[PDB]
Design an enzyme around this catalytic site. Structure first.
Site, PDB file in Angstrom:
ATOM      1  N   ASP A  25       0.862  -1.157   0.000  1.00 21.58           N
ATOM      2  CA  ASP A  25       0.000   0.000   0.000  1.00 21.58           C
ATOM      3  C   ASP A  25       0.921   1.237   0.000  1.00 21.58           C
ATOM      4  OD1 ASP A  25      -2.218   1.727   0.490  1.00 21.58           O
ATOM      5  OD2 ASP A  25      -1.581   1.822   2.548  1.00 21.58           O
ATOM      6  N   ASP A  27      -0.015   5.338   0.845  1.00 21.96           N
ATOM      7  CA  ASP A  27      -0.148   6.382   1.855  1.00 21.96           C
ATOM      8  C   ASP A  27      -0.274   5.750   3.213  1.00 21.96           C
ATOM      9  OD1 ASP A  27      -0.644   9.650   2.063  1.00 21.96           O
ATOM     10  OD2 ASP A  27      -1.709   8.527   3.626  1.00 21.96           O
TER      11      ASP A  27
HETATM   12 MG   LIG Z   1      -2.686   3.303   3.393  1.00 25.77          MG
END
Ligand SMILES: [Mg+2]
Ligand SMILES: [Mg+2]
Ligand SMILES: [Mg+2]
Ligand SMILES: [Mg+2]
Lengths: 291, 291
Positions: A25, A27
């Site tokens: 992932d 952010d």
């Molecule tokens: Mg995230």
């Protein structure tokens, strides 16, 4: 089975040594806002050097791939093939090409210009793109809900008119409820607009992004990966961790983002095993050591 | 207990003879759009003549009481005291005066000018009303979600900023998902905007309108009523019928609106007893006979 173990020492080394691949992932994991997690580019460098495949899985539907790739080099992540990057925007477009019903159909989109670029790049006809000659507006066959910053009650009303036809698909890019900002404020996510659309229409959306398994189908069109030999690294238990469980991946929670260790252990004591990570690390920089 | 009985003959007469009062929902019951249910004004005339109290309970938050009362005389329902009419707009305002926390607080409202009039008429200070001198914007202590035709992602973002404070109330006028139009189309309801607000904020709204029991509390500030001796007449099982059950009222489904008899019997076979009406009639005009 996930018992929320701090990943370190010899365990870290066997886990990384055995893994053929890491799904990240973005952010809350590689960065927060304008700021890279210190030591995150160096982990990516070292994984490539170890000959382990790195791929990126994002629920972002705001930006088309070429602009999403920008953010990587900009925050210190050079050398990335844009083929390494999978967003809900890209995968929604692929799913729509795969599923659009009707004769060998227009998509009504709730979303920005990046999402639209992505959909067009996949051959999709959008509602509200200009009509051929002065012929009719083409039949709308899918409603797509993305991150729409210009969401309005009028777009909501129009989406529901299209969805009166039960052959008209309802699709959501993701169900992320909200997103943390640098200044401590929060932004509403697509899941909140999807909840409005689902309520007013009485329908259930088909979900593209994590924790939907379809995001994995999307990634494994371009690549063979053994999910049993693949780590999933994310900051958000209900999205990244749950997703990794649904895919049969070993999951790792990083504490640089949304979810707190407290919540992960809560869920384990409550025996909710697919919201429990296999491992956790303070930041993904603690993973480089095992390589 | 509700066994979905067609209300007629001697049964109709005992049910009406015994009842001290009738609560009516409006749309789908007294009228649909510009059109009165034929024989509906005459039922209201005949109930008054029998000395039975008629009251009106609406989830409408679009219009303040004096304009809501207009619709009655206009569709053939003369002689109504505006005190007979209870809407989610009126009751939301009352609940906000009752519950607003903070020192002996402004309400941020998602809704139109009618709703705002109603709230001000109850003494409430609204966010975005003009500030005193050039002092600060007053602290927002409640977020109210009403029928907002000008709902936007920006209002959604602002509502969630206010709700970061956990002492800030979240209130919904109603959870109606959508509303049938004369031309066969549907309009999104407040419940869809409330679902968006709840998702983006991670909160649960306090609900004012039916099927919330609070709507009954509101009605019984101005009137004593024995709910055991009170009929609740509505067209919508999840709202009007469920409400009547929660209040201890005898419920009557009219078939001039949203819910179908088919659905009412479905729920009875599924033993979901509080979505089952005690009685049903084709239209409320079939009730006059029992008087
Ligand atoms: Mg995230
Ligand atoms: Mg923590
Ligand atoms: Mg009704
Ligand atoms: Mg019927």
């Amino acid at each position: 089975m996930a018992r929320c173990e701090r990943l370190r020492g010899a365990a870290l080394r066997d886990v990384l040594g055995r893994a053929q691949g890491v799904l990240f992932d973005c952010d809350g994991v590689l960065w927060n806002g304008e700021r890279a997690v210190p030591g995150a580019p160096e982990l990516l460098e070292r994984l490539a050097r170890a000959g382990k495949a790195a791929l990126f899985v994002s629920n972002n539907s705001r930006r088309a791939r070429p602009e999403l790739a920008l953010r990587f080099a900009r925050l210190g992540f050079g050398g990335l093939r844009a083929e390494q990057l999978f967003s809900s925007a890209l995968c929604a477009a692929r799913l729509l090409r795969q599923r659009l019903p009707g004769p060998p159909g227009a998509v009504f989109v709730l979303g920005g210009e990046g999402l639209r670029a992505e959909l067009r790049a996949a051959g999709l006809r959008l509602a509200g793109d200009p009509s051929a000659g002065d012929g009719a507006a083409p039949r709308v066959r899918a409603v797509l809900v993305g991150y729409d910053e210009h969401f309005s009650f009028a777009k909501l009303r129009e989406a529901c008119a299209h969805l009166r036809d039960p052959e008209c698909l309802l699709v959501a890019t993701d169900r992320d409820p909200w997103h943390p900002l640098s200044d401590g404020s929060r932004t509403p996510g697509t899941g909140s607009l999807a909840a409005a659309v689902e309520t007013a229409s009485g329908r259930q959306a088909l979900v593209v992004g994590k924790p939907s398994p379809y995001m994995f189908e999307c990634i494994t069109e371009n690549f063979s990966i053994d999910p049993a030999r693949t780590l999933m690294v994310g900051d958000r238990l209900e999205t990244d961790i749950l997703f990794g469980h649904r895919c049969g991946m070993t999951t790792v929670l990083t504490l640089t983002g949304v979810s707190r260790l407290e919540e992960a252990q809560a869920y384990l004591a409550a025996g909710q095993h697919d919201l429990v990570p296999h491992y956790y690390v303070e930041s993904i920089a603690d993973l480089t050591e095992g390589l």
